[PDB]
Design a binder for this molecule. Structure first.
Ligand SMILES: [Ca+2]
Ligand SMILES: [Ca+2]
Lengths: 295, 295, 295, 295
């Protein structure tokens, strides 16, 4: 099942364009100390498109070393080639990852059957737990709820889905249909500002961007819900809304890296084609961070 | 300037899991015999995500030797990492490609400045002509006409854009603003069913999927326009409509490969996550190809 | 406050193209007997565009007569002219309606300020409670949450909003911002399939189409939520989903009238430009009604 | 066939709450002096929702006497009730209007068959020429090209369509399919900034907002096209772009009325729920009108 609650989609810090593991380790310790229940390394938020294979090995191994088996480490490993995706999955397995996060193939817009065949191929060839990641605004393809349910029903190794389609109809149906196919199938929000409603739909938490900066608050949002305090969960959601929105005024992780820098955790460096946040975004983040008690 | 008229985004035929260069060459001669003005190899129509490094080199080298300088060979070489893109570009340059088609970074949704910096970084480090490729439905990002025009103004090496945003306002403005910044900047449609309108806007032709099966007719659509025969060009556009629509009932190149197979050119073989066309798709194609005289 | 829970947006039955008050009265008694908390007469679901002024008077008066003051009767009275809207509002007032439902002006796409001025003008000129009705898919204009909050803050007579924008971000913000402006401001869902999530957002119920056929079940959905049984509320929502969806496979109230006819309540008659449900829709409704225990 | 070229959707000037027929006549002469081929009175540009019955009659009667048969006067007469629409149509017919513009029923989202039945019901009961008006952004419904073509095929009295769906595929298909069903069926753009492309598609001109302020230039755009000068027509299109865009920065006719007021034609007076243009809008207009030579 991997986890319930908050899994942080952690940034990949750079300094002088190189991996900055000393800043990374400070960030991992902040997550651990604030009750986060998983780390997702090398997702979109960690600039997976621009981190090379040798760097991935170093980052994955170092994350496993710091965490000491306390929470699972889930490694982004999806590409738009089924063959190449398996290769990345087998690399994460060999490094000792606890699962992989595998985005639907981006850019080549596979059919629903193609998506099924992609995950099947991978599932039949690894012992690792696999999390489907649906994010149509980035990939150009949406996993239909029925397709996710078919994957749940058939592929024992696929243990859950990160649902980043923001449509509440999609969220409602993904949760309902997958859990009907397999009661233990996990459904985590892929959007911080949908976590509350995804919990209400009956899902399992969030694979979060906001938790990079506000881990305790995102943890509290889920924890209050799980404890039966719907209205207190909703209040956390409402208090976090400005931060949730600010972190996406430019493409993630541009804002979250500027935020982590303001907070003193990392240098504000990204790799091309990503570039640092505009002054307007930084100014907004500074204000919102201050208002939220994070600065 | 590369070319005006039709540039065929050619498929990559496979047979029993490997490149099928014999069928590829038949298809290349079919293009050349029918007046096509350029080949774009290893675009999305050419299943670029699933063609390995060895295969890319062989496919480009073979194309260059078949074509024998009669028309330019432009090689798809864009990824969502600026670093990796440059490598693919330099590889094409080393083989003797006449140009590269470089899609906007997909999945990571770079800002407009990031897009500019991406093309600037590559432009400064190759002597090849570069064609920007905008296809927001696949990539998750839209190159603004104003960004295209800045690119045209500043980057001598970027010679044009394949405009696959289907919005006629975008088509109108890309053509208008790029040519204002640089009169010889080329603008080719990236949608067959926008070619006619893009010509009417002041553009330079099309980088086509349909011309895989109907090269003479796409050539004619452009030729008639260019000769001043607007209504004749419109009539070819209208006659081709069913074929243009049929080739996108499932994600390209699933239908076009089925079509080429029906016509006896290639084996109907794709690589995961793509899968062969449905029976319903094949039925439509069989009927449309007959009506068009192609079967 | 009008009501919490379920307010039925009741159909206007016709026979031989005339108002059919005998069938209407049977339908009102069904609502009353099943615990509905309000009736909304002459909304979209009651074909307000095609019911003439003399008919409106008869229908409103007859509804008040049958209900005997047991629940409020809220009359649709919004048009796209501010002057004409007031006239309809004053007519409903004079007939003894308990409130009015006033859609944002459709077709002429007023500015946000225009919307404020429209509701202000009306509010300053009636003693009745006014419910704003936001339904951008029909009107071409969306009331921004901030605009609804400004109306809440300023116009004491505007007592709530029927929120039919299906976007969960809109629903979340409409509830949050209006209740922050005025704690007693009511927010009802305008979409049956958003009621659950609108309750979770902290809203007040639903102005329902589905309750025409399944009043007890929609009442149970809200009642369970209000009683603190989130999971039981969600289960009602899930069981009703097929019916919720079926009632909108063609424009409402085309499906709901076909459903009421299958159930024996009304003739399946609409006024032009509306026409009866297709056989496909009827077949679906028959199945879904049967599965739901309504047939 | 009514006309080819430009038909001005003329504003309805108000002064101190009443019709301003003196300014209206100045504006009518401005149109006639500058070669406009038709007037459309009481369209949405003419604030049809807020003009009362007495005022409609006076405005139509005055227009007919000013124009004195030089060009056709087509009267906006469509509502979302088939019954009421027919009344407005017959009223226009009684006054001596040359035609009626009949928008698809807004707000109630009729099915395609309902749309057909709506126009059939009216067509069978008037001798006037009827122009279908499709503007999905305002009405919530899109007339499918196939429905337009059935209408063209069957209803002798329906003489054309004002196509304000901005999607070039819709424009292409409406023109293609209607003219195939009936060669003399007229197709006019309902968006100024689509006129050029609609002409290129095979259409017959435009029912224009811009021509309120720039009648000669819209006439020229069409005239050049019709004379075979495609690039000259495109150049006028490009030169007019800023004005075309500026007139829709707020909902039409808010900007055009501000523009006409700047030019000294009318008082900048609208009826609720419309309100005068913002300072920012007026600033843009002042600048764009100057650059265009109109101020
Ligand atoms: Ca350790
Ligand atoms: Ca009574």
């Amino acid at each position: 099942h991997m986890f319930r609650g908050v899994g942080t989609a952690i940034v990949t810090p750079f300094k002088n364009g190189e991996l900055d593991l000393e800043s990374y380790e400070r960030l991992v310790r902040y997550q651990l100390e604030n009750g986060v229940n998983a780390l997702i390394v090398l997702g979109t938020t960690g600039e997976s498109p621009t981190v090379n294979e040798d760097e991935r090995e170093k980052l994955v191994s170092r994350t496993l070393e710091i965490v000491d088996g306390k929470i699972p480490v889930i490694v982004g490993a999806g590409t738009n080639s089924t063959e190449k995706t398996l290769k990345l999955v087998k690399q994460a397995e060999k490094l000792g990852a606890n699962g992989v996060l595998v985005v639907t193939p981006y850019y080549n817009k596979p059919t629903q059957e193609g998506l099924y065949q992609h995950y099947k191929y991978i599932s039949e060839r690894t012992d690792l737990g696999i999390v489907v990641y649906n994010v149509p605004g980035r990939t150009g393809v949406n996993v239909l709820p029925e397709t996710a349910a078919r994957i749940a029903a058939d592929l024992k190794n696929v243990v859950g889905i990160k649902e980043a389609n923001p449509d509440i109809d999609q969220i409602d149906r993904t949760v309902s249909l997958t859990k009907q196919a397999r009661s233990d199938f996990m459904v985590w929000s892929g959007n911080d500002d949908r976590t509350f409603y995804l919990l209400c739909a009956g899902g399992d938490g969030v694979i979060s961007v906001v938790s990079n900066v506000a881990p305790k608050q995102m943890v509290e949002l889920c924890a209050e819900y799980f404890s039966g305090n719907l209205e207190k969960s909703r209040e956390v959601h409402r208090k976090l809304r400005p931060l949730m929105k600010a972190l996406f005024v430019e493409t993630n992780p541009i804002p979250v890296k500027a935020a982590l820098n303001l907070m003193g955790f990392i240098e504000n460096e990204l790799r091309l084609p990503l570039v640092p946040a505009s002054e307007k975004t930084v100014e907004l983040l500074r204000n919102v961070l201050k208002e939220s008690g994070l600065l």
